[model samples]
Target: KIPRGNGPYSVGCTDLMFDHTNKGTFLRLYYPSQDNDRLDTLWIPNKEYFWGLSKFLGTHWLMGNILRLLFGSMTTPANWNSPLRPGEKYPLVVFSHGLGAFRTLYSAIGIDLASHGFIVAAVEHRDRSASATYYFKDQSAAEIGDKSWLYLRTLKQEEETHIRNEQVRQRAKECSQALSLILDIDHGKPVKNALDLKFDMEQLKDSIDREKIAVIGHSFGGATVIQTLSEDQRFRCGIALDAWMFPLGDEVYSRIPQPLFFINSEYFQYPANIIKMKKCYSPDKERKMITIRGSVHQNFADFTFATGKIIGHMLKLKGDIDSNVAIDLSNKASLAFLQKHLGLHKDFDQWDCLIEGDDENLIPGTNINTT
Candidate 1:
């Protein structure tokens, strides 16, 4: 079962699609909500996403039906269509998902941040990086709810460098576009959510602490965090969770001026990736990194919590560290880092030591060294 958020405030979740096309913005929003009884947010809201995951896993198309049966009814711990908690201008976090992942896959990260009073917009990338994402074909299709699905793009080895770089740039644009959409919503702009949902976009007006924005992502999304922070100074800081640094160009390495934190898995870091992360550092930059001990790349994702221990380990979903334990460490450290960099007055500062990797399950820095 996907665990509920550990923070005090209740969480609410909904989807937003703007401009009604593939070139438009698509995201799942998690935010603090008022205390009211509402249905729990559905996990994996669409079967196309499962089909996308099947293709990504190199499985038969029929496997999508099997996956839907296994997980379709499950729900994350957030209220669906709940009213936004009023009277507070919460911080905003633009969350980017990794390759082969869509917006909903990272609800674990989104709900936790929302519970802690941050509005998290998990952008679904249209760069063909998502396992599956859909948008309306036009205004008529949007009115009738006709959707067009886009699947992940497969690249040849020779095309990897150019294609991956292009995708990351597109991903960064999506992140920035999502932020603008949310900000526009906060300023009371009328938006028509392409999906037929009960939640009102009008509810977000003045509910944002616009100055306290941050960008975060995992793997390719992590590279996106770097690129977004570089291209958009509106994001005050960034957190990269198990970033895959290969998609980034050498030109972007030194351009990120924001305070950046790198949270890595113990088993995922190779010398090459770590070397690229090292390039992101300089004497004047505020860069902090910590590797979660005994963890794998999947540990930061929800799939780690989807199965029994043995099967999970076989799938590399489970690590020596428990999924909950690893996520707790990652989440707490993120809260602390967010508190520090976003300059929030929250008590997340209590976990400040985690940022320095001062805990037993954390390493002060990465174990993979570049010689």
Candidate 2:
């Protein structure tokens, strides 16, 4: 089972869709709630996303039905459409999911941040970065979400360099756009979310600590953290979780001025990936990295927690480390980093010791080199 957040506050969640064309914005919001009376949030709200996952896994379409039936009733820890906790401005985090994953797949990350009093916006990308994400084609056509159809533009060896960079660029823009939409709504702009929920956008007015904003992502989204930091100064800090750096451009490495953190898995790094990460360092920027011991790349994602240990291991979704322990390490370290970089006055520093690999389970370095 996906666990409840360890933070003191109850978590709240809701989906938001803005604009109408094929290029509209889709987001899942997780925040500190006013109370705990609301219903639990759906783990996966749509069947097409499951179908898309089947496509991504190279399985038969009917496999999607099995997945949905098994998981459709499942719920994350967050309260669905509960009122936002009032009286103080909360920090904001814009979360990006890894490739083949959508906004909902990362609720583990989002819920933890929300319980810690940060408003998290997990943006669903439409640039074929997800296994499947949809937008309305027109008034008469179906939403891409239900169709489980997207142009992944799967790369051939020949097109890898150019196409990957192009898509990463688009993903970066989408991140910035999501931030803009949230910021605008926070400033009293009228954005009526398509979902008819109990949430009121008015509650967001002056509710954000604008200067404390950060960008974070996993896998391909990890590269997006770097790209977004380079292009948007509004994001004060960034964290990359087992980032796949090949999709980024050469110039992106040296252009990031924001402080950055990297939380990696022991088995994911190779010489080439290590080289790309090292290139991100500069005398003017603050950089910190840590690789978890006995961990695989999937340990940083929620999919690792969805299945049993045996199957998860077979699929490379589980690692030598326990799933809960691994995520606790990641979430706590990210909190400490966010506290340090976002200049927040919080108790998160208690987790500061974890970053040093002080714990027996962690190795304080990239897989290739120790920090």
Candidate 3:
């Protein structure tokens, strides 16, 4: 079961798309809400996503039908399309999903950040790295809701270096584009949302704390956070969750000037990946890292909560560490890091020790030895 947010505010969720084409911007918005009476947000809103997941797993198409049958009706904890809470200027976070995963898969993280008074925009990339994503071919197709699906491109072993570098660049661009769109909306831009949702884009006007912004992601998305911060200074800081470093280019290692935090999983890291992470460190730049003990890579994703402990472990979704406990550490540490870098007046600094991996459940720096 996906947990409700552990903050004082209730959360709202909605989808936004602009231009309706493959190159268009697509994201799921999570923010503090005015009402909690709305229906819970659907977890996997369409069968196409299940189909995409099946393809991502290299499974037969029919398996998509089976997954849909099992998880199609499930809902996350946020209220769908609820009005945004309007008084304060909320800080913003641009979130990127891991490879083969799309926007909705990280609601556990997005919803929690929103409840903590941040507006989280989870972007769905069109880089063909996602399991499945769609866009209309033209205006006529858009009006008719005729979707054109794009699946993940299976790269040959030889294509790894050149291709993953290209994808990460595109992912960074998409992250920047999503940030611009939201900033435009906050400035009262009247861009129409491609989705026919009841939520009004106008409600976002002046609701964003433009100066206090951050980027965060998991796996490939973690590398995305790094590239995004290097390319866009608007992102004041970044958090990389269980980052897979192979996709990052050598040029990017020395480019990140903003504060960066690495929240790692114990079992998912290797020597080469850890070395790349080390290159990001320099005297002038602020960097911190902490490894979650007994955790696996999937602990950073929502699927870890999809099944019981037994089946989850069998599927490599669960680790020796309890899922909730692991997530709590990550989320709390993130809050502390955000507060410090963004200069917030919040009490998140209560967990400042976590940023240095001071807790018993955390290992300072990393457990993986470079030697």
Candidate 4:
């Protein structure tokens, strides 16, 4: 469950879909809610997802049912389609998920940011890297997670880096487009939404501080954030969480003029990727880097929330440090960076200790300078 904030405005969450020629692309939006009188949507309406999870984890269908039963009724604290809190617009944050993950999986980050007066848009990428995505053939059909299915998709686009790049580029564009769509509707544009929710676009017009926009992601999505920043100028800043920088082009790194931040896990920072991240930094530009002590790649994601201490530790989900403690420090550091760069009026500066790598487990930006 998402925790409530001591802030003035309550958090809100909703899903939005945009036309993408083939099927469509979907995104989840989290913002500050004005009232508690709003309807919430089903947490996970897709059955194939549960089946896929069961198959992947070698669990029985009954196990799937049990898992669903355990997490089914869990509602995040964010109200759905609640009225926008009255004020100058809040900063916009576009969040990209990791490989094989969907948009809803990161409510921990989304709700936290929304509670702190930011609009978080979590984009769900299609076939290339999703558990179950839709496609438009002669008729619409849901595609399940099959290695054969994914292999075919990659093979079809194998010779075309431009095609792959375009796909990633389109995902970023769709994120910005979704943001504009929501803001437009909030600003009084007449756009009919098929989903039944209390949100009226008109109420949100002029509600978002358009100038302050940032892109953030984990794993492959970390690379997506870099690519997104390279392709789109609307995002003024970006933060990559354990970025897989393999797919990036040489030119893309130097092209990034906006401030960039990297929060890496101790186990995931390979020499190649670290070299690439360093190349992107220049003495003249603003860059920040830090490695969480005793953390792994998945520490930056919600997978750590799934198991208990002993099991999680055995699975490497929980580290030498507590999972919650690691995440809190990572997220708190993230909020501080965002506030400093996005110009949000918050006391995130207290986290400056993290920037300096002053904590026992934290490695400051200066350490990267030596390498």
Candidate 5:
């Protein structure tokens, strides 16, 4: 079971598909819940999803049918239709998932931040990056998958530098649109949610700390963070978790002016990626980086939770490091950095040792000390 928020009010969660034409460009909103909760709709109904995961994961088609038999009506910890926690406004963090991943996979990160007093929107990229996403044609119509699934999605992106740059620009725009949609809902806009989740939009009104916004992503989503920060001024800071820097255009590196933080795994940083990460650094840039010792690319993702230690390690899902410890350290470090940059009055800054990689388990990017 996923954990609940540590905040005073109960935490509420719900999924919303913002763009209709884009097919599965959905987002999950986790915020503080209200005292007298009224909404009880399941955003992603457990029955539908039990089967949906099997199809999405490309496992046996019948696996979903079997899954329903075992765990059909069960609800996950993040209640998609729970009421909002009132009184205090919370910071906002827009999160992007890795390739072949969807919004549900990052609950660990989302729940953690929401627990610590922040609203987290985990966006589900359409066919281009997500395992499987859906779009609706009419009010009563069943959701349909994107025609050019993840396979042909990237190919459809222009390869030329100018064209690809334009594509990235568009992507950045779309991300901003998604953010705006959430903010609008929070501000009492009567926008209908695509996922049919139960929750009152009015509850979210004026509950966001609009000024304190950040972008965070893992792997390809990491690259999305940089591109997003470049295109959206609303996002004041970014955190990249073992980012895949290659997808970024050649010119985006030097154009970034916001405070950027890179959290990399020890085994995944290749020379080329590291080179790109370094390019973002300059004498004037307030950049910081840390390497989680014994971690791997998948360590920053939820795949580690799907298997046992030996199997997970063999599949490159688990790192040489303890999964729980690595994740806790990474998350704590992230909270500290975000609090400092977002000007939160929290004591997260006390975890400065993480940024410096002072713990024997971590390695500060600066200490890499290579010319």
Candidate 6:
């Protein structure tokens, strides 16, 4: 089962789309809510995403049908279309998904942060980075099922450097757009959401802690966090989960001026990638790195929780450590870092020492020691 958030407050979730154009911004938003009336959120919001995932995995087409049968109705733990919790402005988090993943795929991370009193916006890329994402072709093409769906490219070895970098650049632009959209809404700028949800974007007006904003992502998105912080100074900090360092430009290596953290999985780090990551650290800037024990790159993703432990392990979707334990560490360490940099309260600051990976479930450094 997908886990509930490990935070104190109830969580609320909704979808957001602006301008109603195919290339317009799309996001899955998670927030702190006041209502206790329980409502469930859809785990996999679209069936087409299943087909995209199957294609991404290079699996038989029928597997997508099988996946939909098994996972289509699964409900996440957040309250759907719930009212935003009021009275105070919350910090903001703009989360980017890994390659071939969708916005809803990282609800575990988003919900946890929201329950801890933050607004999380998970952007769906239109740059062909997500497994599948949909949008309206135009505002006038308005109807119940009238939308355009996009499927992304699978990286080829020959096109790796250029294609990945180009996508990462687009991902950075989308991250900025998502952040801008949220900030504008917080400023009482009215928006018409394409999603037919009960909750409205107007509810978010004056609801965000403007100074406390961060960018976070997995894999290709890891590189996005770096690019975003470099390009958008409005973002206060960044966290990269098992960052695929190759997609990043060479200039991005030593130029990040804000606080940055690298949360890695044990088996995913190699010398070349590690070297690029290390170059992000400078005596004049803030940086920290930690590797989780018994974890792989997939541990930083949601697929690890989509199946039973045995099946997950067999597929290498899960690591030796329990998914919950590994995710908890990753989340806790991230909270600690956010508290320190974003000026959040002591609630998250308590685990700042996790940067040292002192726990048995974590390692102080990555496993790969040679280049």
Q: Report the lDDT tens digits of candidate 1 across residue range 241-268.
A: 9999999999999899999999999999
Candidate 2 residue-wise lDDT, 200-292, digit = tens:
888888999888899999989999999999999999999999999999998899899999998998888888888898899888889988888
Best by lDDT: 3
Better of 1 and 6 by lDDT: 1
Model 4 CA lDDT for position 180 = 67
Candidate numbers, best lDDT first, in rank order? 3, 1, 6, 2, 5, 4
Q: Looking at model 3, how many pairs of residues clash? A: 0
Q: How far does residue 115 in candidate 6 sit from its true spot (Å)?
A: 1.1
Ranking by TM-score: 3, 1, 6, 2, 5, 4
Q: Model 3, range 248-335, lDDT digits (tens) per residue?
A: 8889999999999999999999999999999999999999999999999999899999999999999999999999999999999999
The pairs that clash in candidate 3 are none
What value does the lDDT take at residue 32 in candidate 3?
98
Q: How far is candidate 4 from the true structure (C-alpha RMSD, Å)?
A: 4.6
Against the reference, the lDDT scores of all candidates come to: 0.93, 0.86, 0.95, 0.70, 0.73, 0.88
Q: Provide the TM-score for each candidate, comma-separated.
A: 0.99, 0.95, 0.99, 0.83, 0.84, 0.97
Candidate 6 lDDT (Cα, 0 to 1): 0.88
Candidate 2 yields a Cα-based lDDT of 0.86
Which ten-residue region of model 1 has the weakest summed lDDT? Answer: 34-43
TM-score of 4: 0.83
Candidate 5 local lDDT, 49-94, one digit each (tens): 4444665566775887885665454344555576677788889999
